[PDB]
Symmetry: D2
């Protein structure tokens, strides 16, 4: 769909069981079959499980630029994701929304893979 973009990423599929979060990250390149922003975002963060599951992230959004403009190519920010209807695999897998109203649909594989789609409330 016009609003959805592919994501792929990785997570720690054998996380510590000592109270620590589960490290993960993913990337969206902002091209789909409808639009192309010539940019890519990576989110790096951790999954915090339980009934009030969260994925807390920081992100880097790099736009393709000329070399002369490369100094201003990368935005930084932070997103917190809340799971709709809340193992790390089962914990992460599902639909999530962030504070902007963006939506993150993800499946976590047994091998550490993250796959899914992202819809941003802003940009593009």
């Amino acid at each position: 769909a016009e609003s959805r973009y592919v994501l792929t990423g990785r997570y720690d599929s054998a996380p510590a069981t000592d109270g620590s979060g589960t490290a993960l990250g993913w990337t969206v390149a902002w091209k789909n079959n409808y639009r192309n922003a010539h940019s890519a975002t990576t989110w790096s963060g951790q999954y915090v499980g339980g009934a009030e599951a969260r994925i807390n992230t920081q992100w880097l959004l790099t736009s393709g630029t000329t070399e002369a403009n490369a100094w201003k190519s990368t935005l930084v920010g932070h997103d917190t994701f809340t799971k709709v209807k809340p193992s790390a695999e089962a914990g992460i897998t599902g639909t999530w929304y962030n504070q902007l109203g963006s939506t993150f649909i993800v499946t976590a594989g047994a091998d550490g893979a993250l796959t899914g789609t992202y819809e941003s409330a802003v940009g593009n």
Copy 2:
């Protein structure tokens, strides 16, 4: 392999018709069959082609932490990759950064990045 970790990511497979760079990113979770650092790095940047191609990145390395220690969970840095080992034109290939880490990547026609990463530091 002991020192290699899986990566995946995405890149702009139809970059602007105008001298831009090609936006991209990828992730490594630092677990393999030998070690687990309970952490993940994402690199965000752009590929700059030509005679001496480069991938210029900034990265975020998040470690799993308690919520109380989350304030100190994330390192930030910057890596520049070239194909010079301390080659065909394009992103696909073997790249090395300023630390001597090895990034071996395949770029699929429709935007996928897949490969392996071997870090010269950490773990």
Copy 3:
């Protein structure tokens, strides 16, 4: 005092009056007359005025390292500051606390200067 560190920074002393925040930043080097962490944090952000005044920031915390360890010298994060008892000068000047329970006492000067003290709830 043992818990307090000097800060200095700068703010836009003639900000846009079009709904935009007021850009600012400051630095703490984590040495006082009691402790030295051999590190420094910079906060970069904006002041959002009104009765529910906020300073929203991202920060970089660099520790002194050897060259071999420089790759792991810098932490990144984000702090949101709430004003205790809420011009940009008057708006910014006061006592603020962040989500960690740290406290930021600042005076904004007519020339764009920020001066004050910082007490961190964590680290050191």
Copy 4:
């Protein structure tokens, strides 16, 4: 001066007795008597002394935005400074980064950084 902006910051004035670098940071708000970009940059990094001294930094450039646009308010990058114009040992002096910007700084004995910054880009 038209192209110079005020900076202040702080540095560790008693760095570790052990080969560390000296942690430091500074801020420029991009308002002077000529222009106002409604933005501020902070540089966080460390000074590495010796024969060819360096200040290695990462920076955050926040622009004043509406709250709705705050997600895109902050650029991040990295600057490396040397004293080579495109000198006495220490932080105090005139430094240049890879963009050709000029950072003129005085380091006070007890941790103050003061000076001016002229950017080769932006504004």
